[PDB]
Amino acid sequence: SYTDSYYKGQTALHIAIERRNMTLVTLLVENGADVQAAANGDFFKKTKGRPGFY
Amino acid sequence: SYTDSYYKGQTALHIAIERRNMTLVTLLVENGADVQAAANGDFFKKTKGRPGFYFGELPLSLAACTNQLAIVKFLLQNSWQPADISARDSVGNTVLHALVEVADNTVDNTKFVTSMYNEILILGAKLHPTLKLEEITNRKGLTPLALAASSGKIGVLAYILQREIHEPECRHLSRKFTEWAYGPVHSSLYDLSCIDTCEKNSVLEVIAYSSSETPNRHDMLLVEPLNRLLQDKWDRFVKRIFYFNFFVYCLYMIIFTAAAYYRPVEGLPPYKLKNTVGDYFRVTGEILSVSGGVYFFFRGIQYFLQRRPSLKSLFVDSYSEILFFVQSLFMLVSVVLYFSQRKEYVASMVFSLAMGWTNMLYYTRGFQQMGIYAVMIEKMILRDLCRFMFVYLVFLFGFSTAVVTLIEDGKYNSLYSTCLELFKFTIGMGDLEFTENYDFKAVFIILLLAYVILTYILLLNMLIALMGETVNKIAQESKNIWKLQRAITILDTEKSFLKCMRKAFRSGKLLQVGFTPDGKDDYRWCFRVDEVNWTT
Ligand SMILES: C=C(C)[C@]12C[C@@H](C)[C@@]34O[C@](Cc5ccccc5)(O[C@@H]1[C@@H]3C=C(COC(=O)Cc1ccc(O)c(OC)c1)C[C@]1(O)C(=O)C(C)=C[C@@H]41)O2
Numbered sequence: 139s140y141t142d143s144y145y146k147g148q149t150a151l152h153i154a155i156e157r158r159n160m161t162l163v164t165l166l167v168e169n170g171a172d173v174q175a176a177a178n179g180d181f182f183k184k185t186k187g188r189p190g191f192y
Numbered sequence: 193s194y195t196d197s198y199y200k201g202q203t204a205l206h207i208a209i210e211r212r213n214m215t216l217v218t219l220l221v222e223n224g225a226d227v228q229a230a231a232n233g234d235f236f237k238k239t240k241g242r243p244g245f246y247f248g249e250l251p252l253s254l255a256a257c258t259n260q261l262a263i264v265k266f267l268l269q270n271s272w273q274p275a276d277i278s279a280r281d282s283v284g285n286t287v288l289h290a291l292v293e294v295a296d297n298t299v300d301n302t303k304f305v306t307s308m309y310n311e312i313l314i315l316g317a318k319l320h321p322t323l324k325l326e327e328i329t330n331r332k333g334l335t336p337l338a339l340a341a342s343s344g345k346i347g348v349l350a351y352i353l354q355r356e357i358h359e360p361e362c363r364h365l366s367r368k369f370t371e372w373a374y375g376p377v378h379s380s381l382y383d384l385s386c387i388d389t390c391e392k393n394s395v396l397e398v399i400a401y402s403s404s405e406t407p408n409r410h411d412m413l414l415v416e417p418l419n420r421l422l423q424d425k426w427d428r429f430v431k432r433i434f435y436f437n438f439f440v441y442c443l444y445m446i447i448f449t450a451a452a453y454y455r456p457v458e459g460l461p462p463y464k465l466k467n468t469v470g471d472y473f474r475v476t477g478e479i480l481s482v483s484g485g486v487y488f489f490f491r492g493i494q495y496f497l498q499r500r501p502s503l504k505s506l507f508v509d510s511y512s513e514i515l516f517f518v519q520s521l522f523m524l525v526s527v528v529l530y531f532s533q534r535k536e537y538v539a540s541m542v543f544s545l546a547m548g549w550t551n552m553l554y555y556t557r558g559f560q561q562m563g564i565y566a567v568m569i570e571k572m573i574l575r576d577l578c579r580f581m582f583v584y585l586v587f588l589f590g591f592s593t594a595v596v597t598l599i600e601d602g603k604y605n606s607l608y609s610t611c612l613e614l615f616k617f618t619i620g621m622g623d624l625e626f627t628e629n630y631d632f633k634a635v636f637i638i639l640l641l642a643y644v645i646l647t648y649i650l651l652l653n654m655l656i657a658l659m660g661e662t663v664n665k666i667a668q669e670s671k672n673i674w675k676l677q678r679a680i681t682i683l684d685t686e687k688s689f690l691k692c693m694r695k696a697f698r699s700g701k702l703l704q705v706g707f708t709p710d711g712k713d714d715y716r717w718c719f720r721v722d723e724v725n726w727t728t
């Protein structure tokens with residue numbers, strides 16, 4: 139996963155879901171992905187004085 | 193060709209291109225026609241006091257202006273006589289300058305001008321990979337970007353500043369580069385070249401120091417790279433410098449106020465100092481006040497020399513500089529009278545002190561809430577009272593001289609007192625004491641009544657309606673005028689800065705492409721922006 143201050147916790151499952159890749163999501167879940175991981179980087183948290191996607 | 197003063201230089205090739213006759217153009221070029229002929233008649237030049245069609249004087253620019261890409265490709269690429277893509281007209285405009293010139297911020301104009309500009313750039317890159325057309329300046333020293341900024345061509349700026357080419361072998365022409373995109377959010381880099389640092393004439397200077405005739409002076413600053421740059425520059429260092437200057441000005445005015453208040457009351461300046469604390473602090477305040485006046489004086493002269501404003505827009509713009517300059521002039525005249533042994537220096541000093549406080553309203557500019565009041569006062573003084581002065585003076589002079597003619601040796605029998613009293617009637621501060629013993633009293637009453645009806649009721653409320661229109665017309669325009677004041681403030685603060693340090697870059701000296709047409713790699717000081725868009 140990413141280990142920076144902005145994208146912390148993001149893994150391949152989040153990327154596949156964002157990309158609208160059903161096949162990749164099905165494979166990743168089939169290959170043992172964690173469906174409960176917390177992507178809690180500053181880019182993904184609620185904030186006022188910064189852009190992001192919460 | 194035509195040899196008159198009006199169609200000078202018109203030849204068959206221009207007629208063929210204008211008529212959209214590809215066949216005749218191909219034949220003419222095949223028959224050895226000159227593709228660099230200059231059509232430089234008065235009809236064909238930029239002009240104000242005559243209709244015309246300025247296109248850049250050349251067949252290539254004529255084809256570009258008329259939205260015929262086939263002719264452009266033919267003229268540039270045909271082997272009988274290839275056109276010079278970097279040719280410059282008598283104004284120094286290239287085809288890109290011509291394309292920028294003929295924009296008008298309409299939808300179709302924006303579309304085809306943007307398209308032709310893009311295709312001309314691609315053709316230039318393929319044909320002449322070492323040629324950079326956008327760096328060419330016309331006779332005025334303007335690049336096409338500077339020209340578009342000067343003329344207020346919103347569509348061309350909205351194209352150029354955020355231009356991205358999704359094609360290999362020409363990506364070095366792009367100015368917007370995208371780093372990533374997530375669901376609603378995406379991060380890109382903007383080239384920033386000749387926005388902040390240009391050495392000749394940057395976009396921000398051109399927008400800020402425009403003559404106020406530009407139709408879209410305010411909306412140009414809404415284009416995203418400029419808006420982010422101004423916000424970044426504001427938050428980074430300019431805000432603190434502005435607050436510091438405001439505070440120092442407040443201290444200056446307080447010292448000047450205290451120094452003026454405790455002036456001596458004896459006759460014949462200059463006044464001898466006594467060995468007492470009061471005189472020392474007093475003369476200290478005097479020295480600081482005269483120092484500040486001299487400072488503002490030289491700043492005003494530097495402003496006027498650097499801008500060289502014309503008379504017609506001397507007061508339409510540059511209002512605040514004029515008022516600060518006038519304050520300093522009053523201070524200097526006060527100094528001159530002080531050392532010339534005249535008491536009347538007090539009069540000059542007093543006026544300066546008055547202006548010294550009211551010019552504090554300049555520092556409301558740049559606050560989103562309080563900035564609007566200074567602008568409202570400026571517009572009202574420049575537009576409404578200026579025009580209405582003549583109408584009111586006509587009424588004042590007519591009724592004053594009528595009344596002065598009527599009265600024989602009363603209190604009204606003098607222009608000074610009568611004019612003063614009629615002005616008091618205009619604002620509702622009269623006396624109306626008809627307890628006198630002069631003849632023609634009825635005529636006097638009829639005159640005063642007619643004046644009061646005409647000035648107190650009719651004219652004053654007309655003035656108030658017009659000021660109400662001006663006040664309510666720009667109340668909603670505050671969001672833009674704030675940004676413009678912010679821009680000019682930032683540019684002035686960066687320009688002077690009084691420390692010789694110009695560390696005003698924004699982001700890293702980053703590399704974008706790395707693959708120029710030659711083996712070099714171009715580092716261009718690009719600036720990062722993240723933007724959010726909730727579409728779909
Ligand atoms: C040179 C000009 C243009 C000017 C100088 C003086 C005489 C002025 O009156 C005027 C004419 C005038 C006089 C009286 C009433 C209305 C207008 O307008 C200004 C000038 C106008 C004002 C009133 O303007 C203001 O609200 C201050 C101000 C507003 C907006 C600003 O951006 C600003 O920046 C410095 C200052 C202040 C005076 O200088 C002042 O203090 C005195 C004693 C007269 C005002 O002449």
Ligand SMILES: CNC[C@@H](O)[C@H](O)[C@H](O)[C@@H](O)CO
Pocket residue numbers: 620621622623
């Ligand atoms: C001298 N003439 C002015 C007064 O008539 C004045 O209009 C009224 O008294 C009122 O506004 C305050 O007393």
